[model samples]
Target: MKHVPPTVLVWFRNDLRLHDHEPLHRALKSGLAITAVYCYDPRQFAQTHQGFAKTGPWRSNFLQQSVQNLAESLQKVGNKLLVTTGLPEQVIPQIAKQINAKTIYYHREVTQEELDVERNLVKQLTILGIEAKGYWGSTLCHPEDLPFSIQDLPDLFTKFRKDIEKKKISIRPCFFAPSQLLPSPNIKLELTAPPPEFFPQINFDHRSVLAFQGGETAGLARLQDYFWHGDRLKDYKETRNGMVGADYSSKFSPWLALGCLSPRFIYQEVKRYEQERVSNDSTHWLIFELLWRDFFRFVAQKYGNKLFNRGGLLNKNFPWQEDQVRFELWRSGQTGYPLVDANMRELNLTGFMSNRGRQNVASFLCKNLGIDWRWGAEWFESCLIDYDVCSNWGNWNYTAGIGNDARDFRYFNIPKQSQQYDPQGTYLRHWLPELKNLPGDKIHQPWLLSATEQKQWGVQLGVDYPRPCVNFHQSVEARRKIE
Candidate 1:
């Protein structure tokens, strides 16, 4: 088919991968000369109100790797990837005008900041008489295909999951990029500064629960290794709560969050695995979790501004404290609660933490410490390698008892939970080296070391490792009174 204008711009956003990218495919179908651009948005690397960088070094490193890989992939298809550092509103429109492109296409984003960027860019493009369009490509099930509208999405996960199962939300198979489109004729694409520097020098730590090499290639490799190669998914449900190993879970969140791998692509792979092998709860549960990820996006869409509010969807109010010193202690993994401290330190040092770790730490902050959950959410934004705004805020809100959770606050008993989950204290000792040789049960609660044990181990809790930051019993009582 003959096309008008004969040129288009594919504005890459969170959807970093070239494979299964709907905007790229649709732009190719227009039969126009296509050129792609990705921006290292200045705002992302900037500090938030809490004085923390919105995208910290670790996640920034992963993102840089993903972008670099994406550029190489696009080059394989004979198209150059324009790397720029600026606001999308400024960068995208300028690049479009420079290339003399008549239209801009990209994946849609739901978060407030992303929506603002899109709005500003579309407005700028319209003033220049260019069409700016967005495609919904980040999700497995399209919003329209879901059993409910964004406005009417079920408040509870079970309800939403049940509706999804009843409707049997089917994901579309992955799409291959069309062969290289006609190149833009003699267009000087505007360039910006290179991507931001990666964190901690990018050396792999073998002790890490999961060593994430971020990119489409590494992400797919991980999926293949976990399922087909390692057969880890067959036991994922049973092992998901594990503390110290890579095989406990799929560890796909980092890739999923960065859009390195689309949910549909993973869903289709999971379906393929089910067909060839087992179709048990573990296999189904992974997809169920993906659906939960999709559900959070819907909730963000449903509540709009409220998703980021202090009280969230339920509008439940409580005294949320902001103590900088306490936050620092918490962030530095010195919370005096071993489970909370260990997880915090892991994230602080590695830019990654297990899903179970996230829940425990978030609960400790919001419910146990009586600190504002938003603070913890912002910390995740700054530190987590796999941070997704919708999922981070949505899950924080839900777990903190301020969001859509219908149940009571998830007040985790630190000692009890530690004894149960980390029975041998392997996870605690991994991050807190001071507790490494404290024997089995003693590692989880080093503060409880008997005088005889402390003398024998030559470790004094208050002197050597510091005492608990807050009394667990006192904190629990305080939390109960607040409720």
Candidate 2:
């Protein structure tokens, strides 16, 4: 140990992958010996204000798997991740001191809680005489390169997106994963799993459309398969709305959410596919989706806590109720709307849902049920493996019509949405097997089934299945009365 090289620490946060990782790239370039560590902050696994698991079962498990995959990825590049638990403010500084690290490089987060953690850690690291440097790596468009400052970011997504293209702003190219690394200094690595009570250890459902494995390895492979092998990026615009199957979309969110994949890298791949394969609206649409991710994140940064406030970004205070009974029915996927119920059941069982499913369910919860949008947002925070604070909250803001959008009240016609997206009832029957007896679009609205049709289908409404919690048309009409 007489000639040990001075060490720099790379603190892993939302950014977990090695490729396109600015912090890791910068740390490696420092030529100082580098060490990496991930802290499973207990607070994230704790309950939300709604008294639900903040990091629910599926996401908790996915985060753990992503961390494990990270370790394996680092090992191949001759680096290792020293995994640990506890608050980052405490654990990171403790490790920095233990490793005699001179600097800690980490990714910046958009939301308040994560930023507060960074502030506390930097203070502690300063007290410990270690420099803490953070890099912004999560979004496709680097913050500094945006067409306007966050304070002046356009209020509508259309305008913001148009401004970005109008300015022809450039997304910084990705930094490839390092070929080799300064292995973490020899120390006792305290490998840990999430405590049993932290998240329910629900077994994986075979019914899940995608068996998503977490890590850069799997993330990159998914990119390769979906774009190159499967060649589905060409059809993304059309199939993206499909409610069933993995091939319908990229299925990259879980990885994207965990930073197992990089947004900039995704853009790069899209560009590559365009040049090498074929450029079409479908190919461009995938990038358009990524642009929305960038917008939500920047919006979160711009508005701060308004994104989490009860009325959302606009601060609209829409007389949203918190009827826990109705909310529970929605949560348990027994809302009596087959499409809504099926999506909820899928989320409960698999920790995933389609884009179309999320939109309809959010509308049903906030607009139809008159429940507080935060309740639904918090529930998504608990359930979605692909959940990102900015996108989840921001999108829910839009769904509830409280976000910065031109729409007066964003409502989804549940029956119409079901017939449009799940006409064959493939997705509904798969999740709500009890409704398997019902055929055609009859499954779309179970409560509408008369006693005869119910008996013919061998299911009794309000017995075998519950009625729709509220009539969709009546709820919409009532809200308009408020307007």
Candidate 3:
């Protein structure tokens, strides 16, 4: 009788790359012939409850590049990535049966939708008597290393950060990709077709800060460029909040969101840089941000479906309205608040926005306009190339005053913030050309321009630019009323 090695199906989910992949490493160690598969689940492309495509054009485009990159990387390791479109629960078992695979392995996901899919897949695999295993690989610190259980996780980020720092929890070293893998079994299945385009077709203004490309090769190159080549990590803290440049931030979130880069890998590199280069607030700040990422994941795990509820994790009630006219204004960058409008315009034109910009715009949408925060979150989910469910929702909840924060009110004064972060209006004018002619701080609020001043600048309220959607004083009072 001919001998055949036991086959293991390594299912690739958000953990896309080969390096530091725990599930892949364990599957390789099993000495079983490996077949890797990625399912382009139809549900992701479908509309969400909020009436927006769950996966927007920008992110979908990025994902196509990521999968293609992974396929090529797998080919280099003597393996193939079988791509298909359908529910994973339906496809994984069929593939396992076709290949006579004995087990399936994948990295675990904490979000409700992802968990539901995982559960369904496991149930279907159980029917065929195939073993399905999952591992944790997304967060910087392992769930086991956390000082508290998920149920006992602190409601506030500060407490969580303090405990982790006090315990001195260390990140695990990254696992190395195997030198080679047993060739995939000879089998055929309908493969998912790639998107028509990988890069966005939108015309980005020349001064736009974001020009990120997808794929593991690009991701690794960016990591190297940001840290070693450009030596930008040293000034990360000082420059991270700046509104108008590529080097302003680490720019790792887009890659990290898709699993093209590993948090632990970044952590180890940061430690090495601190040792060989300089260690300061800038160096530690990068890790601090990673910890925030971990905190949101843990928050999602602890709260489960609550994270998605309109009432949010805290179950606070607010009379949020569904104002379509107001929402359209905010969405199209006609809010008449230069900072908010500029940020919105930036997001509309490019699938990216600075962290500082995100906070101001989100605050404006929820607090000033008094619209539902979930609507803002859904818009972001449908627009941002780097949107993560946990961080996006958690942040919206926090800004909406419905999530974990010690303060009763958390809001951004849009005008004040614009002056502080973008004092020169460099970022503002870059996005809002009508206000480009307005000089200095005047760019922050064109509504304040006198009729003569407006004529001089070739601007007309409600003609060249829309008037403020809500009076600044009234908006502030509305925010206070909610509190």
Candidate 4:
């Protein structure tokens, strides 16, 4: 009698890559025919309650590239990636029944929407008598390694970081892709192509910092170049705050956000770099940043839907405005503040912005303009190529003074930040070419120029460039009055 193994199905969620994938590893070790599935949920592409698409074109294109790469990688190892469109709860069980898969494996997600989908999918799978297994493999450090459980997670990042450091928490070693994977069972199922609307027609701008091609191969190549070949890891902390160029930072966020690259792999490489190259604060700072990412994931787990609420995780009420006109101005980079405008323009032109730029712009919108933080967060969700649910919302809450920060009011002075970070106005001129003629600190405040000076610089305040949307001083005063 021939021994027939039960077919197993692997569901690909945010954990897209093969290397360091736990669920895939488990499925491969099962010694059964394996099939993989990715669902393009329509809800993800639809507009949010805030009237912005949850997943925008830039992220859509990147995800398409990532899935395609995954399919190719799986094919080389004797498996196929079955990409489909619909709700996962409805789709997965139907596919399982068709393929006669006895078991399904997937990575776990912590956020409310993702968790709800997972719960529903499990309930539906149970009806078909298909076993469902989920793995926690997204964070750099596993939850089991933490000193405290999700409910007991420190309210402050510093507290969390310190506790983890004191406990000597370490990331697990990355899993290698199995040398052989069982061929997908012969099954009649309708596998659809990726959404045609999501496919991008890319035209690279020469001035753009880097060609941000998405996929695991490109991600690993970038890791190799930034750390070993380029030897840039040694100076990361000092230059990470840089605004203009590609080499300023590791630029790993986009790849990390998409799960094309594993944070554990990054940590492993950082350790290797320290052993072979010079070890310093800059090298450790990369790990520090990784810890911050983990903190947000933990925060998401602890707070759940509160993370997305108007009062945020703290549940503190602050007067928030629903001014569409002001938000439009801020979004379009016509805010009349050069630094904010320059950063906004860069985000508009290319789907990227510096960390410093994000903070300053967020502050200007929430603190300076008195707009609702969620509005800015929703817009960022639509615009940023590197958008992650935890990091994006977590950062927005922090900057908007509604998150874990103890401080009641946090703000950025646009002129001071511009002078400090871009003293020569290099970043300003790069994004806003119209203001290129204005040199030095003058670029930070184009509205400060007298009529005579404006004529000399061939700039008209109202016509050539927009007048400052709101007087900076006046806005500050208005905010104070409201508070």
Candidate 5:
């Protein structure tokens, strides 16, 4: 406390916000003048091996908004956020040297890609004789506070949840940075870098549930509206599977994916509500969902690259196909299955889909088409605004019977599922307006329409709306191969 704090540099990755942020708080606590950097890695914009943009335009736009908001938030707290575009390994060390920072701090990540970034940046900092360190702040419960260590972590979700309930959880209060952070002593740089061009302008659709904007401020505002004001959280469990409107879902994934919001923040808020108002199954389910998110992260850690393979963690060899023509039909939402087609088309155009839609479509793609599940998974990676490498890949693998699920070849009968979930066809009509005229019960099975009735509705099977890509009868026969 006697000497001025050494200049400390904080690097922002997925944790793109200021509120309830441990890394930023720790960095500023150094009592040293602080400088921060956010690298919009060019590699993120490049195509994946699947030939799709690694980060699609929708996520790109959301991330950009988050970063802009973060920069403004930091300004209010008396710090500057330098935005850069390049690989972090090359950028962070250079920023440290330019600022003459003695130490570098960032939130640690568990995924392979993010771990590699950390390793490279640490090596670079070591070469320059600067100390580089990371903090764990991504999860609802910090790993150190968990009932068991990562090695002792349970393989099953039920076991993990039980252990957590029986153990103590560490509660760390959030901190704020001091006003007027001073630059490190003797830190003068003559180098000039080009202005950051990482954030490209993008827009949002008014109808999209993902219309909830991104950033710490926006995250908090949304939390208040959904939990306290609207009291929507009270009915979350019952309405989670509903597909027609924004209220039917929490719609928190986009912000959660980008780290604009913290899971712990939401968890704490939920606990507050339970203590102050009432404790209900709906409130508990929200935390249950957070546990599911953690479960996937743990699965990724346990399986490593196997999670990305066709055999998945189960290592079962299923004859998954890659017929481009059929694949394109599925992607374009031209498949004769109206429910599948409608969901796919919505995802293709809006970069968002409901949980019900995601499940049904994924089943149709892998089970119905007999196509490679990776195709659908990769397409999701490219299109999903809320895409998390772990969740997107993990959930798809689950639907494809490749992840932790004990059962293999788990399939959903699209029409049956449509009827059960959308009994009145409200969701079907919302997305597939072509079926708007069909009566409620008959909307899900329009192919059964009489030729004369179909003609009168101006809904030609093959011409107006392309006939089902594979006859439902033929696809059923094909699926029987797996059974």
Candidate 6:
């Protein structure tokens, strides 16, 4: 009788890359043939409550590139990937059944929607006797290894960071991709054709800080570029908050979001850099931020559905307004606050934004403009190329005066922040070319320009750009009513 190796299906969820993937690693160790698949969940591309796309053009394109790169990575290891668009629960089980595999492997997700899918998929697979194994690979620290139980996780971030550091909890070492894999079985099944949403064609904005190519190749390349050759790590803390340029921040979120790059893998590289070079606040800051990323993910795990609750973790009973007019103006970058406008335009155009810009815009939308924070968060979920569900929603919760933070909410002073971060408005000109002719700090408040000064700067307030949708001073009392 001919011999056939028992096959095991590896379902690629957020963990897309070959390197440091527990799901893939366990499969390699399974002593069985491997079959891999990725489904572009139709739910991700569907509209939000406001009817805007959940996945925007830039991120959709980047996702396409990353998946293709995953296929290439698999090909190098003598494997083929099954790519399709559908609900994973439907597609994965059928593929496992078709391959006659008894077990399926994947990474678990913390959010509610993903959580439901995982639970449903497991239940369905159980009836068929398929063991659906799952792993935790998204965060810098694994949940099981955390010093405290997830239910006992600290509500304050500083306490969490200090506790982790004080206890000397170390991130687990990374799993490198093997030179080759066990042979993969070939199979096909009826599948839904991917909507244009999965792989939307997008235009490149020359003004963007980074081209942000997707996949592990570009991801590792950028990691090496930023930490090794570019030598940007030492100055990251100083420059990370800056508004312009690719080198300002690590720009690792897009890769991190899709699990094309593992946060633990990045941690290992940071440690190496510290050994080779000096370990200062700049070097430490990068890891500190990674800790924040871990903290957010863990927070999501602890709170579950509360992470998305409109009232947030603290559950404040505040009446949040959803002024569509102001939101439209804010969304279109015509809010007349140069800093917020420029940042909004940058995100809408490039599928990215600086950390500082994000905070400013979130405050502007929820606090300064009196719009619902979830409205802004949903927009960010739809817009950011680097969007991660936990970080995006968690950060938005904190910004909206919720989440894990103990600190109270305070709105940003747009004009002051503009001068502080942008100083010369270099980033403003890159996105808002209409205001380029204006010079110095004055560029942040174009409304301050007189008729003569406006002509001298080659901009008309109402004609060239809309005025502030809502007066910042008026918004103070609006959100302050909550406190």
- For each candidate in turn, the TM-score is 0.95, 0.97, 0.96, 0.96, 0.92, 0.97
Deviation in angstroms for 143 in model 5?
Answer: 1.8
Q: Per-residue lDDT tens digits of candidate 4, residues 342-402? A: 8887776677889999999998998889998999999899878888899999999888777
Off by over 4 Å in 5: 1-5, 168-203, 405-408, 471-477
RMSD of each: 2.5, 1.6, 1.9, 1.9, 3.2, 1.7
lDDT of candidate 1 over 136-215, digit per residue (tens): 88778888788778889888888998888887776777888555656776655558766435233665567777777778
Q: What C-alpha lDDT, on a 0 to 100 scale, does residue 110 get in candidate 1?
A: 85
- Alpha-carbon local distance difference test for all models: 0.83, 0.88, 0.87, 0.86, 0.79, 0.86
User: Candidate 5 lDDT, tens digit per residue, 296-387?
Assistant: 87777668788889898777678888798999999889887878887887786667898888999998888788899898998999889889
**Candidate 3 lDDT trough over 10 residues, lowest sum:** 193-202
lDDT per residue, candidate 6, 393-468, as tens digits? Answer: 9999988887645565577888888989988788888889898888767688877788998887778889887666
Q: Candidate 4: what lDDT?
A: 0.86
Give per-residue lDDT, candidate 1, residue 450: 88
True-vs-predicted CA distance for residue 96, candidate 5, Å:
0.4
Q: Write the per-residue lDDT of candidate 2 for residues 1-483, one digit (tens) a residue.
A: 444457999999888888989899989999888899998899998888999889988988788889888888888888888887888998888878877889999999979999999999999999988898888888888898987899999988899999999989988999988888977557654556546676566798888978878788888999999999998899999999997888899999999999999998999999999999999999999999999999999999999999999878988877878799999999998888888999999999899999999999998887788888888899999989899999999999988888865756568998999999987889888888889998757888887778899988888888888887888899988865666
- Model 3 vs. true fold: TM: 0.96
Each prediction's total of clashing residue pairs, residues at least 3 apart in sequence or on different chains, is: 0, 0, 0, 0, 1, 0
Error of 6 at 143 (Å): 0.5
Candidate 6 matches the true fold with a TM-score of: 0.97
Off by over 4 Å in 4: 1-5, 200-203, 405-408, 480-483
Query: Residue 373 of model 6: what lDDT?
Result: 85
Indicate whether candidate 2 or candidate 5 has the larger lDDT. Answer: 2
Residue lDDT tens for model 3, 381-408:
9889898999999888888888865666
